[PDB]
């Protein structure tokens, strides 16, 4: 067993390289993606922001949905920072929703466990929902906060 072994790891890949959060589409439109950031940078940096993700129909956007007329190029954005916490930034032309609740555009919001963001509101048939999966590993790391010392 040589080549087959390589395939086994293919399906069973060690997840948690440095993942911050995971975006999962429940409405079945966009493929699941994994948001990640540097722990050292997050732990060391506690001002302004560390690493933010942009989502939308734009190929530049960290998240590629498709091309919804209602949704904007970069419908929403997610920023990671604070004292070991995540933030959600809405950046849509029509607005970004959280569990049916519309939040203030370009506004910072505290992340939620298995939270969900709805977008494209205006038409019952033109709304798209997304789910946010927080990596428990990232949280556990912060709770322990390892020290970086040479030798």
């Amino acid at each position: 067993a040589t080549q087959r072994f390589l395939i086994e790891k293919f399906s069973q890949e060690q997840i948690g390289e440095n993942i911050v959060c995971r975006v999962i589409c429940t409405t079945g439109q966009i493929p699941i993606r994994d948001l990640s950031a540097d722990i050292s940078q997050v732990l060391k940096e506690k001002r302004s922001i560390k690493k933010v993700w942009t989502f939308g129909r734009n190929p530049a956007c960290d998240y590629h949905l498709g091309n919804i007329s209602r949704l904007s190029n970069k419908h929403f954005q997610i920023l990671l920072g604070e004292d070991g916490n995540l933030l959600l930034n809405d950046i849509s032309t029509n607005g970004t929703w959280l569990n049916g609740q519309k939040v203030e555009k370009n506004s910072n919001q505290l992340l939620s466990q298995g939270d969900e963001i709805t977008v494209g509101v205006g038409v019952e048939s033109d709304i798209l929902s997304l789910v946010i999966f927080i990596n428990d590993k990232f949280k556990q790391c912060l709770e322990q906060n390892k020290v970086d010392r040479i030798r």
Binding site: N73, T93, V121, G122, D126
Partner: peptide
């Protein structure tokens, strides 16, 4: 192609 503004209840 560009973003179109949806309706809004004032």
């Amino acid at each position: 192609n560009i973003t179109q503004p949806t309706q809004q209840s004032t």
